[PDB]
Design a protein around this ligand. Sequence first.
Ligand SMILES: [Cl-]
Ligand SMILES: [Cl-]
Ligand SMILES: [Cl-]
Ligand SMILES: [Cl-]
Ligand SMILES: [Zn+2]
Ligand SMILES: [Zn+2]
Lengths: 95, 95
Amino acid sequence: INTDTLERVTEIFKALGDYNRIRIMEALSVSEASVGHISHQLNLSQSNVSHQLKLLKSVHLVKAKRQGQSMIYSLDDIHVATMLKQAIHHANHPK
Amino acid sequence: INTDTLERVTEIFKALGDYNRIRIMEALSVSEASVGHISHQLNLSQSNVSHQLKLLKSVHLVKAKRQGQSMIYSLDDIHVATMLKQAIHHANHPK
Ligand SMILES: [Cl-]
Ligand SMILES: [Cl-]
Ligand SMILES: [Cl-]
Ligand SMILES: [Cl-]
Ligand SMILES: [Zn+2]
Ligand SMILES: [Zn+2]
């Protein structure tokens, strides 16, 4: 399949090969949330979390939507949710 | 969720952040196959393909099964298949 495609896939997985980015993604899989709420959940700086989310948004793994007086991040779409959830499933069984 | 877990997840995604490993995985998503058959499909050395498959087997993304006089590699299980297919889906639509 296409080279522009299999390159976008590698930048997606590349982006996911980082422990705190995975922690951010897995939190978002529970609930969309603001940068402040995420940094509180994970005990990371708002500066650090914001930087990571823009990296993730760069490869279309997260998106950001104004809601009221907050900027709310979410997993981009159902593909991202399913991909992450299957990965965690696989990491948690034997063989 | 657990640190042994979210570390196994990062090594999975880490392992997938490589163009030829993705090409190998995507070929296997079409059909299980021997090292020779893969290296022919992809025009890569058998030495290179074998090295990559042992890396992938290390993080339980592929498995290897004797069948007749051949050693056949496959995607480990349905979780891996779904994860890869969702990633490629996501890479191929807009927004
Ligand atoms: Cl939500
Ligand atoms: Cl922005
Ligand atoms: Cl098959
Ligand atoms: Cl072996
Ligand atoms: Zn599995
Ligand atoms: Zn998608």
